[PDB]
Amino acid sequence: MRHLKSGRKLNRHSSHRLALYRNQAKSLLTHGRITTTVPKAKELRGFVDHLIHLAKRGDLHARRLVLRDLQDVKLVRKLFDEIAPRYRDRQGGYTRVLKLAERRRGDGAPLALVELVE
Amino acid sequence: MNRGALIKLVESRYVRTDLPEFRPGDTVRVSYKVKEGNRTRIQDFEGIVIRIRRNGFNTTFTVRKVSYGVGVERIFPLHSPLIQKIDIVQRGRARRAKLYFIRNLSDREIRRKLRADRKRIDQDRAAERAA
Amino acid sequence: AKHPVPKKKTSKARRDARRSHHALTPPTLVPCPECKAMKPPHTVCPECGYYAGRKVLEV
Amino acid sequence: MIQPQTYLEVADNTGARKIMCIRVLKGSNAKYATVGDVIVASVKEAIPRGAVKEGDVVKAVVVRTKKEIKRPDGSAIRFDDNAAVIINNQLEPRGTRVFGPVARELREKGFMKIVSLAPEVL
Amino acid sequence: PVYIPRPRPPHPRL
Amino acid sequence: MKGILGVKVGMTRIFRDDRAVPVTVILAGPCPVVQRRTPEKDGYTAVQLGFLPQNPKRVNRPLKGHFAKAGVEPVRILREIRDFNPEGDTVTVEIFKPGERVDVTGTSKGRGFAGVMKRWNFAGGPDSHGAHKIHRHPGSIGNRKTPGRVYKGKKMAGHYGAERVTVMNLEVVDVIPEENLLLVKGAVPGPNGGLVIVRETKKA
RNA sequence: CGUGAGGGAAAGGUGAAAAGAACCCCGGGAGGGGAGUGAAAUAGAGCCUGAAACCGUGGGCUUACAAGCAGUCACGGCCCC
RNA sequence: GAAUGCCGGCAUGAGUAACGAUAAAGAGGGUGAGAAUCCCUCUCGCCGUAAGCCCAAGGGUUCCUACGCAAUGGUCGUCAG
RNA sequence: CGAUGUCGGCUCGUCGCAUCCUGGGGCUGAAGAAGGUCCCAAGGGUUGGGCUGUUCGCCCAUUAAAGCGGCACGCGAGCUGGGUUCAGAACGUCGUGAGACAGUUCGGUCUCUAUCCGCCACGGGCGCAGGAGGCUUGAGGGGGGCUCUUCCUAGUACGAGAGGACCGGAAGGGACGCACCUCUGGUUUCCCAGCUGUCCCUCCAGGGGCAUAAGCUGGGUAGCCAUGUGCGGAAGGGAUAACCGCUGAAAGCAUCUAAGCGGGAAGCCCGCCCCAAGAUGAGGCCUCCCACGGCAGCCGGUAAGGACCCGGGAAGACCACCCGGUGGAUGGGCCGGGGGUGUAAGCGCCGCGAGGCGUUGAGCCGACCGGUCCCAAUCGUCCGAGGUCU
Ligand SMILES: [Mg+2]
Ligand SMILES: [Mg+2]
Ligand SMILES: [Mg+2]
Ligand SMILES: [Mg+2]
Ligand SMILES: [Mg+2]
Ligand SMILES: [Mg+2]
Ligand SMILES: [Mg+2]
Ligand SMILES: [Mg+2]
Ligand SMILES: [Mg+2]
Ligand SMILES: [Mg+2]
Ligand SMILES: [Mg+2]
Ligand SMILES: [Mg+2]
Ligand SMILES: [Mg+2]
Ligand SMILES: [Mg+2]
Ligand SMILES: [Mg+2]
Ligand SMILES: [Mg+2]
Ligand SMILES: [Mg+2]
Ligand SMILES: [Mg+2]
Ligand SMILES: [Mg+2]
Ligand SMILES: [Mg+2]
Ligand SMILES: [Mg+2]
Ligand SMILES: [Mg+2]
Ligand SMILES: [Mg+2]
Ligand SMILES: [Mg+2]
Ligand SMILES: [Mg+2]
Ligand SMILES: [Mg+2]
Ligand SMILES: [Mg+2]
Ligand SMILES: [Mg+2]
Ligand SMILES: [Mg+2]
Ligand SMILES: [Mg+2]
Ligand SMILES: [Mg+2]
Ligand SMILES: [Mg+2]
Ligand SMILES: [Mg+2]
Ligand SMILES: [Mg+2]
Ligand SMILES: [Mg+2]
Ligand SMILES: [Mg+2]
Ligand SMILES: [Mg+2]
Ligand SMILES: [Mg+2]
Ligand SMILES: [Mg+2]
Ligand SMILES: [Mg+2]
Ligand SMILES: [Mg+2]
Ligand SMILES: [Mg+2]
Ligand SMILES: [Mg+2]
Ligand SMILES: [Mg+2]
Ligand SMILES: [Mg+2]
Ligand SMILES: [Mg+2]
Ligand SMILES: [Mg+2]
Ligand SMILES: [Mg+2]
Ligand SMILES: [Mg+2]
Ligand SMILES: [Mg+2]
Ligand SMILES: [Mg+2]
Ligand SMILES: [Mg+2]
Ligand SMILES: [Mg+2]
Ligand SMILES: [Mg+2]
Ligand SMILES: [Mg+2]
Ligand SMILES: [Mg+2]
Ligand SMILES: [Mg+2]
Ligand SMILES: [Mg+2]
Ligand SMILES: [Mg+2]
Ligand SMILES: [Mg+2]
Ligand SMILES: [Mg+2]
Ligand SMILES: [Mg+2]
Ligand SMILES: [Mg+2]
Ligand SMILES: [Mg+2]
Ligand SMILES: [Mg+2]
Ligand SMILES: [Mg+2]
Ligand SMILES: [Mg+2]
Ligand SMILES: [Mg+2]
Ligand SMILES: [Mg+2]
Ligand SMILES: [Mg+2]
Ligand SMILES: [Mg+2]
Ligand SMILES: [Mg+2]
Ligand SMILES: [Mg+2]
Ligand SMILES: [Mg+2]
Ligand SMILES: [Mg+2]
Ligand SMILES: [Mg+2]
Ligand SMILES: [Mg+2]
Ligand SMILES: [Mg+2]
Ligand SMILES: [Mg+2]
Ligand SMILES: [Mg+2]
Ligand SMILES: [Mg+2]
Ligand SMILES: [Mg+2]
Ligand SMILES: [Mg+2]
Ligand SMILES: [Mg+2]
Ligand SMILES: [Mg+2]
Ligand SMILES: [Mg+2]
Ligand SMILES: [Mg+2]
Ligand SMILES: [Mg+2]
Ligand SMILES: [Mg+2]
Ligand SMILES: [Mg+2]
Ligand SMILES: [Mg+2]
Ligand SMILES: [Mg+2]
Ligand SMILES: [Mg+2]
Ligand SMILES: [Mg+2]
Ligand SMILES: [Mg+2]
Ligand SMILES: [Mg+2]
Ligand SMILES: [Mg+2]
Ligand SMILES: [Mg+2]
Ligand SMILES: [Mg+2]
Ligand SMILES: [Mg+2]
Ligand SMILES: [Mg+2]
Ligand SMILES: [Mg+2]
Ligand SMILES: [Mg+2]
Ligand SMILES: [Mg+2]
Ligand SMILES: [Mg+2]
Ligand SMILES: [Mg+2]
Ligand SMILES: [Mg+2]
Ligand SMILES: [Mg+2]
Ligand SMILES: [Mg+2]
Ligand SMILES: [Mg+2]
Ligand SMILES: [Mg+2]
Ligand SMILES: [Mg+2]
Ligand SMILES: [Mg+2]
Ligand SMILES: [Mg+2]
Ligand SMILES: [Mg+2]
Ligand SMILES: [Mg+2]
Ligand SMILES: [Mg+2]
Ligand SMILES: [Mg+2]
Ligand SMILES: [Mg+2]
Ligand SMILES: [Mg+2]
Ligand SMILES: [Mg+2]
Ligand SMILES: [Mg+2]
Ligand SMILES: [Mg+2]
Ligand SMILES: [Mg+2]
Ligand SMILES: [Mg+2]
Ligand SMILES: [Mg+2]
Ligand SMILES: [Mg+2]
Ligand SMILES: [Mg+2]
Ligand SMILES: [Mg+2]
Ligand SMILES: [Mg+2]
Ligand SMILES: [Mg+2]
Ligand SMILES: [Mg+2]
Ligand SMILES: [Mg+2]
Ligand SMILES: [Mg+2]
Ligand SMILES: [Mg+2]
Ligand SMILES: [Mg+2]
Ligand SMILES: [Mg+2]
Ligand SMILES: [Mg+2]
Ligand SMILES: [Mg+2]
Ligand SMILES: [Mg+2]
Ligand SMILES: [Mg+2]
Ligand SMILES: [Mg+2]
Ligand SMILES: [Mg+2]
Ligand SMILES: [Mg+2]
Ligand SMILES: [Mg+2]
Ligand SMILES: [Mg+2]
Ligand SMILES: [Mg+2]
Ligand SMILES: [Mg+2]
Ligand SMILES: [Mg+2]
Ligand SMILES: [Mg+2]
Ligand SMILES: [Mg+2]
Ligand SMILES: [Mg+2]
Ligand SMILES: [Mg+2]
Ligand SMILES: [Mg+2]
Ligand SMILES: [Mg+2]
Ligand SMILES: [Mg+2]
Ligand SMILES: [Mg+2]
Ligand SMILES: [Mg+2]
Ligand SMILES: [Mg+2]
Ligand SMILES: [Mg+2]
Ligand SMILES: [Mg+2]
Ligand SMILES: [Mg+2]
Ligand SMILES: [Mg+2]
Ligand SMILES: [Mg+2]
Ligand SMILES: [Mg+2]
Ligand SMILES: [Mg+2]
Ligand SMILES: [Mg+2]
Ligand SMILES: [Mg+2]
Ligand SMILES: [Mg+2]
Ligand SMILES: [Mg+2]
Ligand SMILES: [Mg+2]
Ligand SMILES: [Mg+2]
Ligand SMILES: [Mg+2]
Ligand SMILES: [Mg+2]
Ligand SMILES: [Mg+2]
Ligand SMILES: [Mg+2]
Ligand SMILES: [Zn+2]
C-alpha cells in the first residue's frame, strides 16, 4: 500500500535521490532546458519551482536557503539576478515538461524536456 | 464540497473558548468535574503540562504530577465540557515541544531544566492590569 | 525447496496457446497538425518540433 | 495492561513488596488485567515478619498501571508503575492500609474499602 | 563434462 | 425500511451527557428519486435514488433521456433501495431521527495483494530458532495422498479490501438537516470521499 | 584436457570449365534485388544429392457447454478430384 | 524402438531464472549510419595500511599508435586486455 | 528397495461422533441446589504455564469445558531438527581381539527458479441474433453460528437446618469476526530541531557532503496500524431429534398411532452479511441510435456509443477499476488554513569568554482541508447498428 503518499522513489536511497534532484536543479537553472526521463522531470518541477520562488523573495535568508541545494554562489547569483526577475508577476508555474516522441535505444526509456518558461 | 469545513462545523457547537493558553513546561491546575456515585464534585489536578498535541477541536494536553510517591499523568481533551477551569500556576521555559524526558529526572534536576519564563510571567502581570 | 521440474514436455499446441496473448499492439499514432506527419499523441513532433501550435525545439 | 509474568509492586502493608502475576481471573482466557481486575500471583519479595511471605500464592486487585486507562469522558490516566493490593477470597484488603494513588475505576467495581484506605483517588 | 557434481545424500530411511 | 445515499465526510467526536462519542460524519441528502420499481413492472419494490449533481457536459444521451423521464437534473450516481417507497420525489436526512439505528454500506479501503497474515490473521512463522524464510508464510495447505488436493475456499494470499462491506446497528447521534449531515456513532467502511448507503437497521 | 606419466577428437565433395557473378539499385556493413556466366545457380562458394526431428508463411476443413491412451466404427456437413 | 545404449542434430521448460557484491548517479558538448554505455566539461558518490604506489613469482606482446566491429565483452558499443 | 523421508514440535486446517462444554430430553437411591445414568444433538467452543526431544504423563493457575479419534499415526518440492538414523570421542557392559549394545553421554551439511491437476487472486477472448449507456431479480454458493458472572424476581418455592430454585427481566464481561483512525498508542528514509568528528564552500558568520542502505539524538503530520474505537453472534418464522401429549381403534379395557392433531433442541430450512445470469436454463426493467452505400454472406461510410493517447486516483504487481482531459481544479506549482518543529538568518544590547537577551511562537515546513488556470491533461485517431427463420 501507498495510500495518499507523495514523492517518487526513483530507485535511489534518501541521499542519492536528493543529490539527483539537486544536480538536476543546477543543470536546468544553468542551461535553461534539459532532457531527462519523464518521471524525473515531473519531480524536478516543484524542486526547482521552490528555489525560483525563494529567489523572488530576494532576502539574504532566501539566498542562504537556496545555497544549501545549489551551492554555487555564481549560479545562485544568476538565479537572483537574471532568472528571478523575469517571473515577478508569475504566481508559480516556473517550469514546464513536454514529452519527446522517441525513446532511448539501449533501455527504451521515454524522455521529456524540462525548461524554464518565458 | 469542503469536507474539512463541514467537520469544523460539527465541532463548533462544542468548541471551547474560555481557557487560558499554556505551553509544555508550564505548571497548571485543571479543575475537573468528576462523578463519585452518585454525586459529582470538582477534583483539582495540578502539574506540569509535558505534552500538547494539536488537531483542532481534538487537541489534547498531558499533565504530570507526583502524587504520594507515584508519578501520575493525565490527558485531557482541551475542549472537554468536563473542565471547570484552568489556573496557570507557573510559566516555565522549555526548549522542545514534548517533555517526556522529565520522567527520568530528579526533582532538583527538573527545577534546573525548566526555569521560570520571566517573559511570559511579565505578560501574566501586564494583562490583568485591566479596566 | 526440492527443485521443481517440468513433469512433461509442453506440446506445440500448448506452447503456442500460452502465446495467445503475445502479439504486439501497434503504436498509437496521430498526424502532426503542422507538417502532417504521423507521430504519437502528446509528444513534441520529431519532424518539425511543433507542439501546442508553436515551435518548441530544433529538428 | 498486566499479564502472566508481569511483576507488580505491592501497594499495601501486607509485608509483600513485589509480586509476579501468574493468572488473570477474568474468565476463560483473558489476556490482560487492568485497574480493577483480580489476579492470582506469587510473592517474589517481602520484608521480614509479614503476614505474607515469599512463595505464597496470593490474590490481588490491580490498583494502578503503566498503560493508560481510557474513560468515557474522553480522558485518561497513567501511572509510573503497576501496583496491586493483596486481597482475600471476599476481595477485601488483607493489609491495614494502602500506599499511593489508586484508580477511580476501583470504586464502581466494589473495591470500596481500598478506595477509602487510599490517600488519593485519581 | 569431466566433472560430475556429487549427488546429494539420501534421506536416511533406517 | 428507508434508505439514502451519502458520502463519508470524516470522523470526529462530540460530547453528550459528559461522554466522548466517536462519530462519523456522513453528507447524506438530498437524493432525488429517479425511477420507482413496482411489482407490476419489475417484480419487486425499490426506489432508484440519485445523488451528487453532474455537469451535463459529461452525461451521455442514453442517460440524459433516462433522467428526463423523471424531470431531474443529471446526477453522478444512481442506486436503488429495496422495499422502500417514499411519498415525495426527494429523500433527505429528515427521514432519520436521532436515537435511531442504521446500517451503513460502503466500499472498504483497498489493501491490494495482501499477505496471509494481514488478510487472514495467520500467525506466520517464527523469527528466530532456525526458521528459514517462512516468517510470513501460511504453513501447510493440505494433507497427503488423501485427499491429494486443496479445499475450495482455502484461505490464501490475494486481493483484500475494496469490497462492499456493511456495518450493522449504528446509532444515529444527530441530524443537521440544513447542511445535509448525518452523525453516526462508530466507524463506517472506506475512505473519506467514498460513497455510502445509510439504511434503517434490520436488528431489534 | 591433465602437475605429470598419459588421454585424445571433430572436420572430405561448386562446376565440364572459375566462366567464382563487371556494372546498377536498397544498405554503415552483412545481406539482398537486377544484370551477367553456365546444360543446370533452391550447382553462388554457409556450394552434389539434401531424408527426419524441428521452426515458419499461405490455403481447405475444423473448434470457445466441452471429460480425453486421442484412436476406431457409423452417419451427416463442408472443401477437392 | 527401447540397452539411465553410442555419435550428431533439433525440441521442451521460456521470452521464464539470471545478466556476478546495494560505492550511485545527473546533465551539457563532441563524434558517428547508429550512443544510458566511447571522448570532453561541470555536478554528485566510493576507496585512501587502498580499491593508491614500487618489487618478486607467475603470464608472454596483453605495452604504444593507426585503421576496424563478424566473433569475444553476460546489454550496448563509434569503445576494449 | 533404477528411493513412498522417518519422532516430536510449528504452521494451516478439515472430517468423524463412541459429546469435554454449551442446547433439548427420560430415569434417579431426583426435597432444593448440585450430581449420577442413558437418550437426542457435531452449530460453535474446547486457556496459560513448570519438567522432559518427547508423543504420553504428572504438576501449578484457571475454566462453561479444558473431549477422543481419521486424514501416508494429516501436513519436511511449507518451516524446524531437540530425538531417531552415518563417519569423532567417552562411560558402563560384552568380547583375547578387531569391534559390539531398544544401554548411556557430548558433537555432528535439511536441495534459490512449479510444467500439469488442485488452490487463492486478476485479466484477455468469445458467447448471451441489432447496436449501446445505465440500474437490477437471485437460481445457486460462501461467511457467521461460542459462552460466562452479577443482579431483579427472591433469601421467595423447596428445606429441621445449612443451603437455595424453575419460569420471567436486567446489566457487565472473555475470546473470536468485520470495519475504522475521532481518542489512546505505534511507525512515520529527510517534516523540523539539537549534537560529534572530518572534508569543503568563503576567512568570520552561515552552510553542504560523509560517518547506514537516516552519522547520532530529541520530536513528529497524512497514510498504513493495535494496544485503541464502532459493530456482529441474534431476534423472529418454519419443519423436526429424543422426549411429552390430544383424540383413537384393531383388541368392550388399555394404547402418542394404525385414520387424524398438538408440544418439542445451541442443531435443520428461512431470515442476516458477501459473491453471484458462462444460471450457455446466458434472466428483468429504464433510456439512447436506427429502415446507410456497393456486389442469416461480403466489403465499405456512420449513428448511439466505445476504445486508443493523456493528467491522475486511500484502485492497483501487469491488467482491471474509478475520476479528469482547457466549456477543465486531474496532477505539479503558487496562496490560505491545518499540522510538525519550537523562537531562523541578520541586526542591537549584555558578558573578557562559553554564551545570554530582544527582535520572535520566529524561521523552516511531505502527504492533510481548500483556493487559484501560473505549468502540464496540445492536436487527434481507430473501432463501432442497418437487426436470420417458423
Ligand atoms: Mg511497503
Ligand atoms: Mg496524491
Ligand atoms: Mg530498485
Ligand atoms: Mg531497477
Ligand atoms: Mg548517507
Ligand atoms: Mg516545495
Ligand atoms: Mg506532454
Ligand atoms: Mg512514446
Ligand atoms: Mg544504445
Ligand atoms: Mg523451501
Ligand atoms: Mg525443502
Ligand atoms: Mg533453503
Ligand atoms: Mg516456492
Ligand atoms: Mg530450484
Ligand atoms: Mg503450430
Ligand atoms: Mg500439435
Ligand atoms: Mg500452455
Ligand atoms: Mg508468457
Ligand atoms: Mg496474440
Ligand atoms: Mg528467595
Ligand atoms: Mg524460601
Ligand atoms: Mg508507593
Ligand atoms: Mg558425465
Ligand atoms: Mg546430479
Ligand atoms: Mg456503494
Ligand atoms: Mg484482516
Ligand atoms: Mg493480526
Ligand atoms: Mg510473529
Ligand atoms: Mg538451517
Ligand atoms: Mg525455505
Ligand atoms: Mg530469516
Ligand atoms: Mg504473510
Ligand atoms: Mg508427508
Ligand atoms: Mg482425490
Ligand atoms: Mg478490487
Ligand atoms: Mg592445464
Ligand atoms: Mg598443459
Ligand atoms: Mg565438384
Ligand atoms: Mg572439382
Ligand atoms: Mg558434365
Ligand atoms: Mg579448381
Ligand atoms: Mg549507397
Ligand atoms: Mg553484396
Ligand atoms: Mg534486397
Ligand atoms: Mg547480388
Ligand atoms: Mg539437356
Ligand atoms: Mg533442386
Ligand atoms: Mg543441383
Ligand atoms: Mg557432380
Ligand atoms: Mg544443397
Ligand atoms: Mg539447406
Ligand atoms: Mg528442404
Ligand atoms: Mg497456418
Ligand atoms: Mg449446462
Ligand atoms: Mg458450440
Ligand atoms: Mg477414455
Ligand atoms: Mg449408426
Ligand atoms: Mg524391442
Ligand atoms: Mg536410441
Ligand atoms: Mg526418467
Ligand atoms: Mg543427444
Ligand atoms: Mg516443438
Ligand atoms: Mg535447449
Ligand atoms: Mg528451448
Ligand atoms: Mg514477462
Ligand atoms: Mg516458469
Ligand atoms: Mg518470475
Ligand atoms: Mg538462473
Ligand atoms: Mg527478472
Ligand atoms: Mg547474483
Ligand atoms: Mg555488473
Ligand atoms: Mg550488479
Ligand atoms: Mg555510503
Ligand atoms: Mg545534472
Ligand atoms: Mg552523456
Ligand atoms: Mg552508447
Ligand atoms: Mg550505438
Ligand atoms: Mg568519457
Ligand atoms: Mg590515512
Ligand atoms: Mg583504516
Ligand atoms: Mg619475469
Ligand atoms: Mg595465459
Ligand atoms: Mg580508434
Ligand atoms: Mg564486436
Ligand atoms: Mg557489436
Ligand atoms: Mg554494427
Ligand atoms: Mg572481419
Ligand atoms: Mg559477446
Ligand atoms: Mg555484444
Ligand atoms: Mg560475464
Ligand atoms: Mg565506426
Ligand atoms: Mg591499453
Ligand atoms: Mg524401499
Ligand atoms: Mg529414475
Ligand atoms: Mg521412479
Ligand atoms: Mg528417485
Ligand atoms: Mg483434527
Ligand atoms: Mg449420538
Ligand atoms: Mg448437554
Ligand atoms: Mg445438559
Ligand atoms: Mg436438580
Ligand atoms: Mg439428566
Ligand atoms: Mg460440535
Ligand atoms: Mg471438530
Ligand atoms: Mg496444555
Ligand atoms: Mg514446556
Ligand atoms: Mg525456568
Ligand atoms: Mg519454558
Ligand atoms: Mg510434555
Ligand atoms: Mg513419558
Ligand atoms: Mg458445569
Ligand atoms: Mg505422519
Ligand atoms: Mg496429529
Ligand atoms: Mg510429518
Ligand atoms: Mg526439509
Ligand atoms: Mg517433521
Ligand atoms: Mg510433502
Ligand atoms: Mg517431497
Ligand atoms: Mg541431531
Ligand atoms: Mg544442532
Ligand atoms: Mg569398563
Ligand atoms: Mg575385557
Ligand atoms: Mg549407541
Ligand atoms: Mg528398549
Ligand atoms: Mg555417559
Ligand atoms: Mg559446537
Ligand atoms: Mg547426540
Ligand atoms: Mg538441485
Ligand atoms: Mg503453471
Ligand atoms: Mg504450460
Ligand atoms: Mg493433471
Ligand atoms: Mg470475464
Ligand atoms: Mg443480458
Ligand atoms: Mg439462495
Ligand atoms: Mg454452478
Ligand atoms: Mg434475595
Ligand atoms: Mg417452612
Ligand atoms: Mg433466565
Ligand atoms: Mg493516529
Ligand atoms: Mg488523524
Ligand atoms: Mg499519537
Ligand atoms: Mg527538506
Ligand atoms: Mg543529514
Ligand atoms: Mg559538518
Ligand atoms: Mg565556522
Ligand atoms: Mg566528500
Ligand atoms: Mg569517503
Ligand atoms: Mg527519528
Ligand atoms: Mg514517536
Ligand atoms: Mg502520522
Ligand atoms: Mg413447531
Ligand atoms: Mg397418557
Ligand atoms: Mg389415552
Ligand atoms: Mg398418523
Ligand atoms: Mg407437531
Ligand atoms: Mg445462540
Ligand atoms: Mg450485488
Ligand atoms: Mg448475461
Ligand atoms: Mg448481476
Ligand atoms: Mg447447469
Ligand atoms: Mg497508474
Ligand atoms: Mg473518460
Ligand atoms: Mg480531447
Ligand atoms: Mg487542480
Ligand atoms: Mg491544485
Ligand atoms: Mg500548502
Ligand atoms: Mg502553511
Ligand atoms: Mg498554521
Ligand atoms: Mg501551530
Ligand atoms: Mg532568541
Ligand atoms: Mg534571531
Ligand atoms: Mg546568530
Ligand atoms: Mg563586546
Ligand atoms: Mg509554526
Ligand atoms: Mg475560476
Ligand atoms: Mg492530429
Ligand atoms: Zn510536425
Side-chain angles (χ1 to χ4, degrees), chain F residues 121-135:
Chain F
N121 325 129
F122 280 20
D127 304 310
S128 89
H129 294 286
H132 191 33
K133 296 152 95 190
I134 43 86
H135 316 273

Side-chain angles (χ1 to χ4, degrees), chain A residues 70-89:
Chain A
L70 291 186
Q71 301 272 137
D72 196 329
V73 214
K74 272 177 178 174
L75 161 95
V76 170
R77 188 177 309 119
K78 190 206 170 188
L79 175 61
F80 272 48
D81 290 14
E82 321 169 9
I83 305 186
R86 76 201 211 192
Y87 295 128
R88 147 177 45 118
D89 299 322

